[PDB]
Design a protein around this ligand. Sequence first.
Ligand SMILES: [K+]
Ligand SMILES: [K+]
Ligand SMILES: [K+]
Ligand SMILES: [K+]
Ligand SMILES: [K+]
Ligand SMILES: [K+]
Ligand SMILES: [K+]
Ligand SMILES: [K+]
Ligand SMILES: [K+]
Ligand SMILES: [Mg+2]
Ligand SMILES: [Mg+2]
Ligand SMILES: [Mg+2]
Ligand SMILES: [Mg+2]
Ligand SMILES: [Mg+2]
Ligand SMILES: [Mg+2]
Ligand SMILES: [Mg+2]
Ligand SMILES: [Mg+2]
Ligand SMILES: [Mg+2]
Ligand SMILES: [Mg+2]
Ligand SMILES: [Mg+2]
Ligand SMILES: [Mg+2]
Ligand SMILES: [Mg+2]
Ligand SMILES: [Mg+2]
Ligand SMILES: [Mg+2]
Ligand SMILES: [Mg+2]
Ligand SMILES: [Mg+2]
Ligand SMILES: [Mg+2]
Lengths: 146, 186, 260
Amino acid sequence: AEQTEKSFLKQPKVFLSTKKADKAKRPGKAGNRFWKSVGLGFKTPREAIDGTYIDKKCPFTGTVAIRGRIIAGTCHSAKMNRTIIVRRNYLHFVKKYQRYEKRHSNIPAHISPCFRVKEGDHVIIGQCRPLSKTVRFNVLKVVPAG
Amino acid sequence: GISRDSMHKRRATGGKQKAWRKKRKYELGRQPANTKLSSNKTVRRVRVRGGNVKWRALRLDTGNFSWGSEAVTRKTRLLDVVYNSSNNELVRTQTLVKNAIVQVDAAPFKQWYLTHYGVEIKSNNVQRKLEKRQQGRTLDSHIEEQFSGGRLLACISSRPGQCGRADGYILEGKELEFYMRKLQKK
Amino acid sequence: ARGLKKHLKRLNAPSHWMLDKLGGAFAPKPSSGPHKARECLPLILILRNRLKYALTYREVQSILMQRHIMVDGKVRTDKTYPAGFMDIISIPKTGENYRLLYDTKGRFRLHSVRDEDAKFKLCKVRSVQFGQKGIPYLNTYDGRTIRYPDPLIKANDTIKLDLETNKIVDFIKFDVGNVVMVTGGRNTGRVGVIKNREKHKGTFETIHVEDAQGHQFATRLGNVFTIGKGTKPWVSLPKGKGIKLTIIEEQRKRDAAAQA
RNA sequence: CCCGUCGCUCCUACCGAUUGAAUGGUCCGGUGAAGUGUUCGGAUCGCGGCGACGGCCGACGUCGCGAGAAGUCCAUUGAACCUUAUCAUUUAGAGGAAGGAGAAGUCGUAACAAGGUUUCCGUAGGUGAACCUGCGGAAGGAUCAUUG
RNA sequence: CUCCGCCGGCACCUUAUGAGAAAUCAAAGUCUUUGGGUUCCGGGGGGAGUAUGGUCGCAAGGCUGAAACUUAAAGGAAUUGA
RNA sequence: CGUUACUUUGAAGAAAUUAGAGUGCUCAAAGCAAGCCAUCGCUCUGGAUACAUUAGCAUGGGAUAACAUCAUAGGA
RNA sequence: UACCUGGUUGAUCCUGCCAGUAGUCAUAUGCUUGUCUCAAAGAUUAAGCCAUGCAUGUGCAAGUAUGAACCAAUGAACUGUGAAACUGCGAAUGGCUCAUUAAAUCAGUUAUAGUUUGUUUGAUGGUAUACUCGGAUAACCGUAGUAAUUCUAGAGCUAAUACGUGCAACAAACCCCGACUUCUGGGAGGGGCGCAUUUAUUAGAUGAUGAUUCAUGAUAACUCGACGGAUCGCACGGCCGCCGGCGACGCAUCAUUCAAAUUUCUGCCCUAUCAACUUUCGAUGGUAGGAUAGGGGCCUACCAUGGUGGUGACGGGUGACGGAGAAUUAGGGUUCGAUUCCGGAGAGGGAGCCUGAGAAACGGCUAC
Ligand SMILES: [K+]
Ligand SMILES: [K+]
Ligand SMILES: [K+]
Ligand SMILES: [K+]
Ligand SMILES: [K+]
Ligand SMILES: [K+]
Ligand SMILES: [K+]
Ligand SMILES: [K+]
Ligand SMILES: [K+]
Ligand SMILES: [Mg+2]
Ligand SMILES: [Mg+2]
Ligand SMILES: [Mg+2]
Ligand SMILES: [Mg+2]
Ligand SMILES: [Mg+2]
Ligand SMILES: [Mg+2]
Ligand SMILES: [Mg+2]
Ligand SMILES: [Mg+2]
Ligand SMILES: [Mg+2]
Ligand SMILES: [Mg+2]
Ligand SMILES: [Mg+2]
Ligand SMILES: [Mg+2]
Ligand SMILES: [Mg+2]
Ligand SMILES: [Mg+2]
Ligand SMILES: [Mg+2]
Ligand SMILES: [Mg+2]
Ligand SMILES: [Mg+2]
Ligand SMILES: [Mg+2]
């Protein structure tokens, strides 16, 4: 079902054709789906542990690590393959007038199939290595608007 | 020369970026090895950053291949390139790249299987160990039907243009079924 | 730049060196070595600016090329050798031994030590992990690698190293209640006991230290160096005893000294 | 006190055909040095080899390995050149038409008094010029006022 | 019709304890004892609502809108005189 | 197992420049020296401290304010 | 020092500007100029063009002397001191300038679990004629060529820590095959096995991190591996020929240090008479590769239609390098920041490279 590419898609360093298969072993062993806790107090979604998708850029089942900044925001666009635009809204202080002005930043973030998101949801992203030209963040937690 | 810099790209907004510096050597790229499957082995020494060595295979005909379920690794001849997921140009040109699907000689694996299991696909100790191994022995009949022709489907897991070698694993299981469907659809 | 910098402009030199502004265009750029360039005291500074043995760059060269100076038991002839915190500087001709400690103002001070006390240094464990062959090994912040360390030794620990034998003779576990000296930041040279360790996932860890007179200060984990098990440091301390004084109390001391 | 036209001396700016030129940048096609990688290539040089000849040396025939220059092939980066058009400049320019300043002539007297037709706003037409007139509006009016 | 109230509206009269350059204004007040909220909009007088570009309009024109240059005043309210 | 602004405290925010402690370069602009009855030496001599928007990290506070909810609580 | 004064009128009070008044680590210019201390100085216009000279060379006891070199000694390989030359290292720092460049540089703040790093410091190194291998070459010497240049050819010599080879002091353990044995085993023998490289399988529990299929172990193989000392100085003693100290230089691995590269967030002047821009031919994302030291449309193939924008995208202007800072400042603020500190960039304009740990180097090369 997940094999939608011109290539087979496998989790790196997981031997699927193992003969001594076992489910009591740790993830990635005996043909088990690999997954990890990203750390920083973030729970691993159960749909990543029980998923069948293959995403190398997934924070929980892929090869990327979360290190650096942790940024909150709102889903501003979700029209790309596994990538969403996160809009951050903040107040910029103007020194001379002692006032604030509203400013925004559009941060591209990779979203793994373990989350389904819609424009307007509150998301938490964590900094990772560069994944594309503009993406340096991975969605870590999605809070729906309602 | 070939560069890897973000200078020449457009911005994410679409705006053009005016250059503020010439190309640095620490951001170069080199021309692809374009490793061909041929019995005229040529691997060239590439001097890289730090005075280190990169091995650039131009023509290769032999590789180190692992049969993961059997946990055995043998040196086998490369016979043909059959499937590439990025470009069939690389299939017709017989270009060896990482994740290419190739035909490899099955003779070393047949020999090892006969020696280790006693089964073709003289002592009490030898026969006892052979019967112990033969108990629970299970092949998957797809590897068997390609053993009949003497050619095993394999995936090149090494990068020939970087390490100068064409190494890989023998395809098994779901990956094997996927690539057999791809090759029959070809 | 197209490579490493070889020169240190005198203005860009570390401020704890107390180099003067008009002494020249340049400062001694510390050579690579056991301590970081920004946190060391080069040998030329110790010999000329501090101990006054030499009066010039060339005189420092003359002293060092005579093989008169040993750093931690070994003869050094490099003038920009980066001598650092807790290093033993011995001159086995005048029979004097110096431990590089910090005064409460953040500046390295050559502290005279006994001959027996110059036989060990205190090192801070940077990491413990498996090397080649699966052999456990220890590394410190002063550049030493020690193989087969005691398994009870962890990162951020303080080990006592015998310079003669080059082995860990004792070690201190980084725990609450151990006397420490701050080696970095604005509290450099301050001595107190750890009261609590506040940990925050993914960022630097904060240590809360209270000195003997009751003043409380906080600093990052990378700037804390354990110097004793409990309230008794393993080495001798400079005259300040790590107790920082406010400028008002310093003025009180100056007034009392002038009055006497 | 004052407004405008027309005269006359200078200054500034504008429009302006000539499809005005000069300068550089982009766009489109090409051509394309040089380097880098790659394919052949093999001047030449070594090491050995088989047997032999002549007196360890030397020559020839013989046969392998290794290194390898010129040259050459394809790819790549790509200066630079030519071409189309565009942009940004600099920019003459017949002629036209403003504004200002200065002398200051001329024709009147339009605005200031109810300025001698009260003034002005908008719009339209006309006239040597200030202006005139039509329609609606305002008092900044020359009326804060007719229960008479 | 008459009288007394309440709310809302167009206004009017008196008064300064206010404000203002004053005229005057019961808001044009509650401002150097300076801050309720918000929109538009001015920065000496001309050149100039002109040139040019853009946009709207069939047109007339509307909206947006300079600069070069020039000038020591222009202007407001009030007083006395003519 | 609601955030944020705001505020408080802490760590950082190079040096030089600035503010500022000490110090009689003869004064001063300076400099980072120096001082001590005179000392085969000493004062462990000194070579402080403050400031450093905004943004980032951490601590306490929740008045003011912003956003998100806010009778299938269908609550536990 | 929280400051005003003259100028519209016959006179008045205003609005309002003009003019004056002070400063400038602010330039020029004029006049004048005795002493002390201090001190900028071809930035502004031309990152315009340059005669000449200099700015990068380098030797320890410890790589290599047979100068037909010098001093001293006077049957001995090499006395000593040593020019020259080979070898090694450096010349990627520093100095100069501010042309380009407007979220770009840069600043503060992150990250590398996304990499390289000569050197320093610390630790580490076992399965590959030996009382020690081979061929060259410089200096030297002498035949030259050319108008000429650290332009250049041929001949004769001879070194190594140059170059190229080659024993590499020996070992256990572990893995595989496996004659025989009496046998769920024993077991001769054979093969593998240093370190590095590449792939694959497996362990890493309930040693490490906030977090890793992590550190690291084991196994199967793989590679035509520039690795695993044919080097030098001083002292030279102990046992009966064998052992033997203190060093120097060099190879490889990890760590450290010196750093770079890339990278997170936030922050920049004027302009809307610049409102749409980007996407054929990368624009935004996805998959698989290639390339790189390493992440990444960095590039390629295929796929999807995204991405930015009145919270001003895109474009234009800047007599725009950014910052630390500077001038003036009651407070708030205004203006400047070519220049000695930090960062960046360039070496007439482009482009491309070799060497090297490090350069897209220009007191290096190649081309236009
Ligand atoms: K650099
Ligand atoms: K009239
Ligand atoms: K009138
Ligand atoms: K009423
Ligand atoms: K070099
Ligand atoms: K920064
Ligand atoms: K990469
Ligand atoms: K991609
Ligand atoms: K080098
Ligand atoms: Mg009239
Ligand atoms: Mg009239
Ligand atoms: Mg006000
Ligand atoms: Mg005006
Ligand atoms: Mg003021
Ligand atoms: Mg430099
Ligand atoms: Mg591992
Ligand atoms: Mg990729
Ligand atoms: Mg400029
Ligand atoms: Mg500057
Ligand atoms: Mg300039
Ligand atoms: Mg200069
Ligand atoms: Mg600089
Ligand atoms: Mg450069
Ligand atoms: Mg020039
Ligand atoms: Mg260059
Ligand atoms: Mg030069
Ligand atoms: Mg240079």
